[PDB]
Ligand binder design. Structure first.
Ligand SMILES: Nc1ncnc2c1ncn2[C@@H]1O[C@H](COP(=O)(O)OP(=O)(O)NP(=O)(O)O)[C@@H](O)[C@H]1O
Ligand SMILES: Nc1ncnc2c1ncn2[C@@H]1O[C@H](COP(=O)(O)OP(=O)(O)NP(=O)(O)O)[C@@H](O)[C@H]1O
Ligand SMILES: O=P(O)(O)OC[C@@H](O)[C@H]1O[C@@H](OP(=O)(O)O)[C@@H](O)[C@@H](O)[C@@H]1O
Ligand SMILES: O=P(O)(O)OC[C@@H](O)[C@H]1O[C@@H](O)[C@@H](O)[C@@H](O)[C@@H]1O
Ligand SMILES: [Cl-]
Ligand SMILES: [Cl-]
Ligand SMILES: [K+]
Ligand SMILES: [K+]
Ligand SMILES: [Mg+2]
Ligand SMILES: [Mg+2]
Lengths: 310, 313
């Protein structure tokens, strides 16, 4: 791959639309079991917070050197204000819709002895009224960017993903989709879809061989009119499927500490590279390198320009 | 045959119990578990409902009020959301609040995460109040003492009772009875207490494991003499409870026919004893009523209370 100029990345405008969330971590001690149940008791000593979901995707684009706009729906609560706060110092351009009746999506991880004990999730469906207002703001924000990134976590944020895809493709913009669910007809006309094994296995079933996997993907792209499919395979790296053929990149990870959010790094890198004129094939190689780097960091971290290149 | 006199309601109304100790917030998260965590071999809980109840020294005080007595609550509460909820909950509890504020203190809160009527984890937030705030509340204790009949020391080792010894003296010198819910292994701080109410584990920590019932009586009698404590009341879960005094022993067996949730049963116990004593009810009858109350409150969910209308009909 060819080293990419930072000033070229500077003109990469990525519009991230999807489910934003707050990654909160509780670190504590377990000295005893509960006197009420055969479960542990955690005395929390410390709390850490990072942007997650669509926000994690957006911030990954900024750290790489690109520009990122985040269109999402956030509730009027404590986790909500915390996201607004974190976004203000992230570099991402916030375009947040506010839903008073919506609990802001928050993923609460409870740890002890550097060992996770439980994850507590708060989330719900945004109101239909809010989703329309966000859709209206999308029409406004669409011509202001180059690449559209759909970050789906099935929290109801991308309820009108189909309409938005058509509008972006009708505007000549490239549409990238991080899938979730088994429908995937809503992802019709997407330029690039980026599932992991579990997400792909949900819509096409478990493949019996590479040729079988080759067929199921090719059959899927034709059915859904999707130009390319990018299957991230964890420790197996990733594989890009298109009419131009297949490219398999092995996992480059030197040290594997925390994997969580690596898929976000993958799709953010591809999007921000494509927005910098970088060819799809080269964007994928850099994405795999970025994923291999971000995997050696604790939590849902990012990867800077300086780390990816030198 | 009459075991204990049905206590008149206006007799309990004159009972003024001063609860001092560690107050907390019992928050509950009821959620669904549909998958394992993609990050760890642990469950993922999608919380659907939250509930909150007064706990710790606060739960004891509310038990005092539902029974028909009056309760005052001297405690330390932080300047945060869980703290404001306690303040907000005490507003409709019937308990007279005497709250000392500590801005550096996280309000003690016990967070229980449930799924499919099954507890998965309890998450605790707690710290030590500062010396300055403790001294301020210590002086406020002087103002409250002549306003109350009995003094209930609800210790949960959350730091709120660092000056128990000093307060016990002031209460005893004022001729007031001092009831103590113990914690730790020292118990020299509890010197001069009228009645002390440990569970089996709390007592097992200070005198070790008793090998027989006679061995238990020996250690308790030894403790009482060595600590200048008139009576010791040992709650023993499904065994019921045993009162130890100079006048002898009283064993009351567990009465609950339905055991749903036990959490905070000892709170109901010492609360009942306190309000009964303040209502002029003799100690022996108080324990009997306390055992009846505990048996009732055990059949209820969460940190519940038992009201007069249930205990006496
Ligand atoms: N041991 C590993 N586990 C997971 N990902 C790894 C590992 N080593 C390297 N990676 C890279 O991190 C990426 C994560 O992709 P993947 O885990 O398949 O999707 P995700 O579940 O959305 N996260 C992979 O494509 C790899 O390039
Ligand atoms: N099955 C039971 N388990 C626990 N306590 C019970 C049960 N049935 C009745 N109780 C009553 O609950 C009271 C207090 O219980 P206990 O656990 O000993 O105190 P605690 O630990 O401070 N709460 C006992 O004295 C009993 O009267
Ligand atoms: O889909 P759910 O599990 O409900 O929510 C996503 C979480 O599992 C985490 O998954 C990651 O995304 P990826 O792991 O790269 O997909 C990150 O975005 C984290 O911020 C996020 O909290
Ligand atoms: O476990 P530690 O921190 O010592 O006490 C807190 C709990 O165990 C429970 O105690 C019970 O008696 C009740 O007071 C209840 O409200 C409280 O949550
Ligand atoms: Cl997998
Ligand atoms: Cl025990
Ligand atoms: K990471
Ligand atoms: K109960
Ligand atoms: Mg993913
Ligand atoms: Mg107790």
């Amino acid at each position: 791959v060819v080293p990419v100029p930072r000033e070229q990345l500077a003109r990469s405008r990525v519009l991230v639309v999807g489910d934003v969330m707050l990654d909160r971590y509780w670190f504590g001690n377990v000295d005893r079991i509960s006197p009420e149940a055969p479960v542990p008791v955690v005395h929390v000593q410390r709390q850490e917070e990072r942007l997650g979901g669509a926000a994690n995707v957006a911030r990954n684009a900024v750290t790489l050197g690109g520009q990122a706009g985040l269109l999402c729906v956030v509730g009027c609560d404590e986790p909500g204000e915390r996201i607004v706060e974190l976004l203000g110092s992230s570099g991402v351009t916030p375009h947040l819709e506010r839903d008073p009746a919506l609990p802001t999506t928050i993923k609460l991880r409870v740890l002890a002895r550097q060992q996770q004990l439980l994850r507590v999730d708060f989330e719900a469906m945004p109101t239909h009224e809010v989703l329309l207002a966000g859709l209206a703001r999308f029409d406004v924000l669409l011509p202001q960017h180059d690449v559209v990134l759909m970050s789906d976590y099935a929290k109801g944020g991308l309820t009108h993903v189909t309409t938005m895809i058509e509008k972006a493709r009708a505007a000549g913009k490239a549409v990238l989709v991080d899938p979730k669910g088994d429908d995937w007809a809503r992802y019709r006309g997407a330029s690039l879809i980026t599932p992991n094994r579990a997400e792909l296995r949900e819509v096409v079933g478990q493949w019996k061989s590479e040729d079988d996997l080759r067929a199921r993907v090719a059959n899927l792209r034709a059915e859904l009119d999707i130009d390319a499919l990018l299957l991230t395979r964890s420790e197996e790296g990733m594989t890009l499927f298109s009419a131009g053929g297949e490219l398999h990149a092995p996992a480059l990870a030197r040290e594997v500490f925390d994997v969580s959010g690596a898929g976000d790094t993958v799709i953010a890198t591809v999007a921000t590279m494509l927005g910098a004129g970088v060819p799809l094939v080269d964007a994928v190689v850099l994405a795999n390198r970025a994923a291999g780097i971000v995997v050696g960091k604790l939590g849902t971290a990012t990867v800077d320009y300086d780390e990816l290149f030198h």
